[PDB]
Amino acid sequence: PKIHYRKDYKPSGFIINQVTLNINIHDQETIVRSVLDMDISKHNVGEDLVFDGVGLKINEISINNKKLVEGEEYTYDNEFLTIFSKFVPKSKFAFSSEVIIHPETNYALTGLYKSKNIIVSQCEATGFRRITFFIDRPDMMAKYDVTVTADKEKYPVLLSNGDKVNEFEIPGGRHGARFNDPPLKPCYLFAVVAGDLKHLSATYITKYTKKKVELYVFSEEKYVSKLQWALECLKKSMAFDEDYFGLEYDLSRLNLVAVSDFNVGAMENKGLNIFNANSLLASKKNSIDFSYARILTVVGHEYFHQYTGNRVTLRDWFQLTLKEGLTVHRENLFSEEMTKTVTTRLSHVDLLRSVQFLEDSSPLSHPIRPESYVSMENFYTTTVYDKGSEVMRMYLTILGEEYYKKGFDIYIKKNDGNTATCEDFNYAMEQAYKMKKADNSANLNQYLLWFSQSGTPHVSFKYNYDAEKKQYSIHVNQYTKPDENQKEKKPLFIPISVGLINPENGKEMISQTTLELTKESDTFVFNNIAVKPIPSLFRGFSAPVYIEDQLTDEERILLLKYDSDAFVRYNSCTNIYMKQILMNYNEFLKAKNEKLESFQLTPVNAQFIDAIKYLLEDPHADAGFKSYIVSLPQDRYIINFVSNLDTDVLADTKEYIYKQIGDKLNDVYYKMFKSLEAKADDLTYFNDESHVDFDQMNMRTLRNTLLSLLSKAQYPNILNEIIEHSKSPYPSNWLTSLSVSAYFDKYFELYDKTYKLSKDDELLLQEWLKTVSRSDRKDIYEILKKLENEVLKDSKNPNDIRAVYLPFTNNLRRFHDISGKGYKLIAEVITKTDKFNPMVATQLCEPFKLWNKLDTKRQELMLNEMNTMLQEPQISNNLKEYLLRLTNK
Numbered sequence: 001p002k003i004h005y006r007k008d009y010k011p012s013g014f015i016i017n018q019v020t021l022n023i024n025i026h027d028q029e030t031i032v033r034s035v036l037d038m039d040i041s042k043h044n045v046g047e048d049l050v051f052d053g054v055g056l057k058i059n060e061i062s063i064n065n066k067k068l069v070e071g072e073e074y075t076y077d078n079e080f081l082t083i084f085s086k087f088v089p090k091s092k093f094a095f096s097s098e099v100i101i102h103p104e105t106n107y108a109l110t111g112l113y114k115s116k117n118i119i120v121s122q123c124e125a126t127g128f129r130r131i132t133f134f135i136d137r138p139d140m141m142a143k144y145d146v147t148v149t150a151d152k153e154k155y156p157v158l159l160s161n162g163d164k165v166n167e168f169e170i171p172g173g174r175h176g177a178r179f180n181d182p183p184l185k186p187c188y189l190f191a192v193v194a195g196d197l198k199h200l201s202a203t204y205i206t207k208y209t210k211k212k213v214e215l216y217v218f219s220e221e222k223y224v225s226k227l228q229w230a231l232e233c234l235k236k237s238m239a240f241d242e243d244y245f246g247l248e249y250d251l252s253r254l255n256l257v258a259v260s261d262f263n264v265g266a267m268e269n270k271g272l273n274i275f276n277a278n279s280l281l282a283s284k285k286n287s288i289d290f291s292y293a294r295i296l297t298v299v300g301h302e303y304f305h306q307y308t309g310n311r312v313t314l315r316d317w318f319q320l321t322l323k324e325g326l327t328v329h330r331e332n333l334f335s336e337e338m339t340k341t342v343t344t345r346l347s348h349v350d351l352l353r354s355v356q357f358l359e360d361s362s363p364l365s366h367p368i369r370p371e372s373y374v375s376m377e378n379f380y381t382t383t384v385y386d387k388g389s390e391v392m393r394m395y396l397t398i399l400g401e402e403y404y405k406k407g408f409d410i411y412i413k414k415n416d417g418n419t420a421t422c423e424d425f426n427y428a429m430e431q432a433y434k435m436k437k438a439d440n441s442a443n444l445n446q447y448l449l450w451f452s453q454s455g456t457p458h459v460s461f462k463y464n465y466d467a468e469k470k471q472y473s474i475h476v477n478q479y480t481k482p483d484e485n486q487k488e489k490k491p492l493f494i495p496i497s498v499g500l501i502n503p504e505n506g507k508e509m510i511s512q513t514t515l516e517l518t519k520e521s522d523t524f525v526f527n528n529i530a531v532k533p534i535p536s537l538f539r540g541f542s543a544p545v546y547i548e549d550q551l552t553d554e555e556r557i558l559l560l561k562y563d564s565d566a567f568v569r570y571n572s573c574t575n576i577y578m579k580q581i582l583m584n585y586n587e588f589l590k591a592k593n594e595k596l597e598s599f600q601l602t603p604v605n606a607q608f609i610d611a612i613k614y615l616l617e618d619p620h621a622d623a624g625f626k627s628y629i630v631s632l633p634q635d636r637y638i639i640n641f642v643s644n645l646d647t648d649v650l651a652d653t654k655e656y657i658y659k660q661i662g663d664k665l666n667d668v669y670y671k672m673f674k675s676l677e678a679k680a681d682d683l684t685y686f687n688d689e690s691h692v693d694f695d696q697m698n699m700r701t702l703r704n705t706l707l708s709l710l711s712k713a714q715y716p717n718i719l720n721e722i723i724e725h726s727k728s729p730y731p732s733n734w735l736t737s738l739s740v741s742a743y744f745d746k747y748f749e750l751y752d753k754t755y756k757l758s759k760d761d762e763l764l765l766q767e768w769l770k771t772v773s774r775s776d777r778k779d780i781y782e783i784l785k786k787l788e789n790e791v792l793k794d795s796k797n798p799n800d801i802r803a804v805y806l807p808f809t810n811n812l813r814r815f816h817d818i819s820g821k822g823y824k825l826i827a828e829v830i831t832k833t834d835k836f837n838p839m840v841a842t843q844l845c846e847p848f849k850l851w852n853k854l855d856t857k858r859q860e861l862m863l864n865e866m867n868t869m870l871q872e873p874q875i876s877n878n879l880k881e882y883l884l885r886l887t888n889k
């Protein structure tokens with residue numbers, strides 16, 4: 001396998017000026033004719049002409065309308081087409097070809113493929129070379145003129161980029177459309193779609209130039225009534241970019257299309273965005289509440305790529321974080337503004353500190369700009385997207401809104417063009433930084449280490465208060481553990497948003513202040529501090545770091561009650577739980593290792609329980625926040641703090657802490673679950689397709705969280721509540737009724753009732769599968785085998801496969817069964833999936849990422865399964881490279 005290095009970037013010695021495509025789709029094959037108008041670039045050194053082209057069946061190739069001869073003038077090995085230089089012209093010339101491809105049997109979902117009755121393309125990153133020959137790298141910009149033909153009855157709707165310029169009838173029941181897209185684009189932004197598509201549409205009038213933009217959202221006919229929310233999300237997304245960034249859509253039309261079979265969430269092809277149906281379609285009757293935030297963020301994300309990816313483009317794939325990290329940052333600012341709930345930011349932090357921190361301390365650790373790759377298929381990671389987004393968000397923290405907006409406008413003005421690199425972005429923020437400091441010596445040079453250095457920095461704190469002097473000092477230290485990418489880790493530029501809270505009255509003692517930590521350690525001193533403060537550190541989670549606050553639980557409890565920053569309040573509560581978790585885990589571990597006949601456990605801090613009750617009982621406090629404070633930190637967050645983690649000991653620890661708190665608060669939880677009903681489940685706008693109330697949904701989250709706590713505890717007669725909840729019209733409630741009934745004899749009665757409610761909507765059936773998979777059932781292995789035989793069968797839909805298996809892999813007791821049977825089962829699924837879809841096979845490897853963090857026995861069980869998968873003779877390149885890197889071999 002060839003390793004591509006970032007240091008090795010060089011421009012092509014060719015240019016492709018114009019692509020003219022004819023894509024003729026037939027029952028058993030698709031014929032693709034392509035003419036490329038080419039030139040020799042100024043970098044050319046007389047080399048062979050080499051096209052990417054994977055799995056293509058050549059009918060013929062030509063230069064300037066003369067057929068080329070296989071063997072004597074060119075070789076093709078199913079990956080590269082090599083035309084020997086003696087036969088390549090030295091001025092403007094035309095290369096043509098006709099190849100045959102087979103979208104019907106393309107089950108890897110990359111290139112051109114069939115999803116149910118829709119034909120659709122997926123070109124990022126290197127899928128265009130599965131459609132026709134090309135120099136398939138993002139710096140090859142060309143013009144595109146595309147014609148598609150197909151059977152009119154099967155494929156009445158034909159779409160590709162640009163203007164539809166001609167439509168025409170073809171003998172034998174066929175038809176055609178031609179689309180011309182004159183502005184230059186990279187080939188990974190080409191798209192085509194054909195199908196019996198239905199739609200909703202609206203007209204949006206831009207803010208400044210008042211251009212009419214037509215918006216179309218498409219699906220298969222069955223689900224067209226689930227498109228309205230997506231259309232509202234698109235309007236909101238355009239308004240946002242207009243209001244916050246001053247940016248208007250440049251084209252006359254934007255199409256959104258939902259497909260059933262898709263590897264990720266969606267894709268930003270220019271004016272033709274294609275989506276996983278689960279991230280475009282929703283209704284109140286047939287979707288859980290999560291689908292509403294999901295569609296808003298995914299529609300938003302692909303819209304924002306129209307500037308950050310599509311008009312300012314990447315030179316090479318190493319700069320991927322520049323388009324993805326920045327688009328995620330734009331997406332998160334939009335979500336925050338649209339939902340107006342504090343749990344939106346908290347949920348982004350929850351994701352980074354569980355999943356991304358785990359990745360960053362694993363053998364897979366990489367900086368947000370890597371120095372090498374082998375498979376572009378495995379490069380689209382939480383580190384590139386989500387830590388990339390936190391790095392892009394730190395510029396805004398450092399500069400503030402006014403100067404951030406100035407530096408961004410600087411980057412967009414200069415590079416609307418025009419490929420760019422991460423240094424160009426940094427340069428633009430620097431110019432805003434010079435202007436902010438009003439000092440032109442000031443620079444962001446050290447900031448660049450955020451792109452190049454891998455691993456999570458640890459940031460720790462000591463304090464001093466001199467009561468006579470009224471002088472308060474915060475001593476800060478940063479450290480990043482050496483790893484495979486850097487032996488010596490340099491200090492980063494770490495912005496620490498802070499407040500100082502008066503412990504007597506809960507008030508702020510200082511204005512907004514962001515500490516700029518630029519050295520291994522520094523001491524920040526504040527004068528005129530009248531009383532000893534509690535420091536509120538990393539407000540908003542202002543850098544992607546392990547925060548070691550060194551506060552007492554009494555201080556943490558005070559922040560949790562009285563601080564103004566949601567993240568700090570949640571983090572204080574998190575740190576109280578972690579102190580408790582590590583304590584009880586070591587007490588359980590000692591008792592198991594020493595085989596003790598009796599031992600003691602440290603109870604949960606009583607004043608922390610009192611503070612939870614105080615917050616729950618506060619009718620003005622936020623319900624979404626309340627659901628965060630009654631839940632323990634995620635297992636994948638906990639694992640970052642324990643060596644050789646025994647998952648059974650952690651399951652017993654979590655069980656003890658939940659029971660400790662429930663034994664004090666279950667009456668309070670019951671009362672709230674009942675008093676929340678009226679507002680949480682209010683049906684007033686149930687038939688209003690466009691009315692989405694994020695606060696109401698967070699009330700439902702809370703009720704569903706409290707119901708789960710009450711069921712685990714077997715609170716008296718709670719089954720009555722579960723059975724009533726199953727009759728709710730909201731799928732969030734009735735699916736919740738299924739999972740909490742796991743602890744009762746009614747489980748299979750609700751399994752059947754909710755299957756029946758779910759079975760006729762393809763997405764809602766996928767949510768039912770996830771609910772079953774995640775159910776806390778002792779017979780969960782037999783239940784999985786039942787879903788396999790009855791519901792999943794041999795589905796190659798990645799949504800179906802992921803729904804049956806991924807939630808189960810989070811079942812701490814059972815997936816991690818000491819016999820290794822769970823690791824066995826997931827490995828069998830990965831290998832089976834790898835036969836047809838290597839990308840999804842790699843996604844199904846996710847539970848294995850923490851393998852070297854677990855206890856001795858479990859490390860060995862997981863390594864065994866990874867080595868077994870690695871030894872499969874038919875392993876894909878993608879799965880092989882991933883598992884070799886994961887197992888350090």
Ligand SMILES: N[C@@H](c1ccc(-n2cccn2)cc1)P(=O)(O)O
Pocket residue numbers: 110124125263264265266267268301302305324376377378380839
């Ligand atoms: N850029 C989009 C996308 C689509 C597909 C893939 N993909 C990566 C490997 C194979 N397909 C990557 C990104 P997005 O960030 O999902 O908007």
Ligand SMILES: [Mg+2]
Pocket residue numbers: 054055056057100101102
């Ligand atoms: Mg083929």
Ligand SMILES: [Mg+2]
Pocket residue numbers: 260762797
């Ligand atoms: Mg299906």
Ligand SMILES: [Zn+2]
Pocket residue numbers: 301305323324327
């Ligand atoms: Zn993206």
